[PDB]
Amino acid sequence: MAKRVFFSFHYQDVIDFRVNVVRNHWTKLNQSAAGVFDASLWDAKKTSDIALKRLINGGLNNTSVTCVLIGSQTFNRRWVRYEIMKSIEKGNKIIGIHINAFKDKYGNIKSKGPNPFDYLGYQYSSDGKQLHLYEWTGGKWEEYKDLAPYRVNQIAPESLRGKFYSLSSVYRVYDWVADDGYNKFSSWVN
Amino acid sequence: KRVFFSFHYQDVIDFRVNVVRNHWVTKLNQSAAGVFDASLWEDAKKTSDIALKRLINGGLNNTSVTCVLIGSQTFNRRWVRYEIMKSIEKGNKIIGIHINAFKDKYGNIKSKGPNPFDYLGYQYSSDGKQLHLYEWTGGKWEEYKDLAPYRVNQIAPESLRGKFYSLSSVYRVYDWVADDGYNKFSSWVN
Amino acid sequence: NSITHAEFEFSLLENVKYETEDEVPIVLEYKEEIINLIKKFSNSGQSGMSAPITASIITNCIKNLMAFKPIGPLVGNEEEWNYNSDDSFQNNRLSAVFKTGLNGKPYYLDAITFVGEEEYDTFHGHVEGISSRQYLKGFPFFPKTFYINVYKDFENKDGEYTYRIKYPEQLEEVFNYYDKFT
Amino acid sequence: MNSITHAEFEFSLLENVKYETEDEVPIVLEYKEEIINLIKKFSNSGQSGMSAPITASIITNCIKNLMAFKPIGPLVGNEEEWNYNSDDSFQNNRLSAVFKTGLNGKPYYLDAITFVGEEEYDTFHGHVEGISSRQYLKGFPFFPKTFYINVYKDFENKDENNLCSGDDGEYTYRIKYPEQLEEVFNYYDKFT
C-alpha cells in the first residue's frame, strides 16, 4: 500500500548526485514529495521565510516518513534542521541515511558527515505539557528559533521533564553501504 | 509604416523612450518588438552574438525607418552602432532624436549626448564597388568589426573613392524640445 | 561551496576553440557575477525542498529587474507617478504604464505583442482594432504581455495586405486580464 | 551607479517596510549585492533596446539551470559524460538525475514528470496509472524539461493493486487530463 517519503537533504552539488542515486532506487508503491513553486505566477514582498515554511509544511502533511540523507555539511544547514524539527511536530517517522560512500566520477567518496540528530534536541517543560526545542550553534545549545515551543497532547511523566534529549537517542541512522540499502531501503521506511 | 527604435539599454533611457512610444499611437504606427525566450525549445540553441545579430537583422528587415533615440552615452554603445550600421546596409531611412530632457519624478534630466553619427563612417574601395565601414573607438578611426564590407550598386565615382566620410552629414538629428517633437515626431518618420 | 558543477559547465564553454568572435557564448561575459550569485545561494542553508523555491524567487526577481519591471505588483498610489509632464503621467516603477490626466485610466504600452507567421515579424501596433496598449483593470497590477498571432491578408485588404487576428480565442484571455483600449 | 536607479528603488521598497518578525523579511534581500552587481555588468555591456531582452533571457536561463544543477546547454551523452563507478546504473555527470542501465542502455530522466494533485501542496514523484516520474530520453543532444501532470484521487473506483492512504480514506491516483501525456511523449519515450 503506497507511502510517500519526504527526502530531507541539504543543497550542494557534491551530495545532490548522491541523493539521486538513492532516488533511482526508491517503484509503483513508492512516492516522494516534490516542489512545484513558480514565483512568476503570484510579489517578492510576500515570498519570505514564512512562505517557505508553508510550502515545506504542506509537503510534509502529505507524507508519513521523513528520511534525512546525510552528507558532509548536512548537520548545520538551516532548512534541513527545520524539516527535521517540523517532522517531529507532525509525528512523522524519521530516519537518517549516510550516503557519502557513493563514488564520484573519479572513484572518490567522503567520510561520513556528522549525525544531524546530534545537533538537535528537545526538553519537556516542568509541567510536562510543552516541548522546548534546541539546536547546537554558536558553541552552545540555543533555543530553536525556527520553531517555537509547542503544547503536547499527552503530558510527559515527571521523570521525563527538565531533561535534555538529543535526537540521536530517538531516531535511527543507517549506512547505505554497510546496512545494504540496495536491498533493505524499503524495509527502513516501511 | 514600421519603425525600428534604436537606443541603448539603461533604465534612465528606457523610460524616456517610452514617452516617445506613448506618442507613436495611431493605427498606422508600428514598431519592431523583440520576442525571445531561451527557456523554450525554439531559442534553446541561441547562445552567442550571431543569434543577437540574426534577430536584430530580422527585426530590421521588417522596418523602413530606424529612429535612434539619443542619450548621454548612446554614441558609445556596441549594439546601437550595429543597428545603425545594419540600417545603412539595408537602406533604411535613419534619424536621430535627443531625448535627454524628459524629466524623471524628481525633475532630473541628462546631459545632451554626442551625436552617434559622428562616431561612424565609411570609405569606398578604390574600384568603387565596395563600402568599407569604420567606427571611432576613443582615439582613432578603426575598421568596423561587427559588419563586414559589402558590395553596392552605385558604382561610385572617382571623386568619392578612397575618401572617408562620417555619417553626421548623411542623417538628420532632431531635438525633442527645440524641434517640437510633441507636434512633429510623426512628420520626421513619414 | 557548491560550485563544482557550475565551474565545470563554464569550463566546457571556455575550452572550445571558436572560429569567430560571434560564436563565443554570451554567458561567459557574466561568469564572475553568475558564480558569485551561485556561491551566495549555496551558503544560505537551502534544503532539497527549499532550494527550488528560493531559486525561483531569485531568478524571477532578476528577470523583472533586467526588464525594468517591478519585483512586485504596481500599487498605483500617488508616489508611483511622475508628475513632471503636461498630458500623460508615467508610472515610476513600470514606465510603459501611463494615464492621460491625473484621473485618466492607466494603460500599458506592452500589453500585447503581435506575432506574424514570418520569423522575426513581431511588433507593437494596431491589428483589427486591437492595440498593443490596453487599459489596466485596476490595482494592484501584475504586469503581463500577451503574444497574439496575426497573419497577412492579401486577398481581402482594406500597400498589399491587411493584418488580421489569427486566433480570436487568444483575445478572450487578454480581456480577462485587461480592459479594451478604444 | 548610473544604471541601477530602478533596481535600487525596487529593493528600497522592500527595505522601507517594518517587519514584525524575521520570518517576514523578503528572501531576495539576502541577494541584493549579487543581483545588483549582475544588473551593473549587464547594463555596461553595450546592450541596445532590441538586444537586451535576448541577452537577459540567456543570462537568467543560465542562472536557473545552474541553480538546479542542470547543464548550461544540452547533454551530449558521450563517453566522458558518465560516472562508471557503479555496478549497474551509470549516472550522468552533468545532469545527475539522468541514468542508463548498462554501457549501451537507454538513458532515462528521474525528473521528467512531477505529479500535481487537486489539493494545494499535493505534488510528488511516483507512479500514476502506469505513468512514472522517470521517462526515457529520445536521444542526444538532450535539453531537460519537467512536465507537470495533473492528477486526482479516485475514491469510488479504487484499484487494490495500487492504493494510497490519507485522512479521507483509500483512493488511487488517476491522470486527470490524458491529453497532457501527449506533450510528454513528444518529448520523452515512455518508460515501462
Curated annotation (Swiss-Prot), chain A:
It is found in: Cytoplasm. Disruption phenotype: When this gene is missing the Thoeris system does not confer phage resistance in B.subtilis. Its EC number is 3.2.2.-. Activated upon phage infection. Keywords: Antiviral defense, Cytoplasm, Hydrolase, NAD. InterPro entries: ThsB__TIR-like_domain (IPR015032), ThsB_TIR-like_sf (IPR036490). One of its GO terms (molecular function) is hydrolase activity. Has an N-terminal TIR domain and an C-terminal antiparallel beta-sheet. Belongs to the Thoeris B TIR-like family. Monomer; not seen to interact with ThsA. This is Putative cyclic ADP-D-ribose synthase ThsB1. The lineage of its organism: Bacteria, Bacillati, Bacillota, Bacilli, Bacillales.
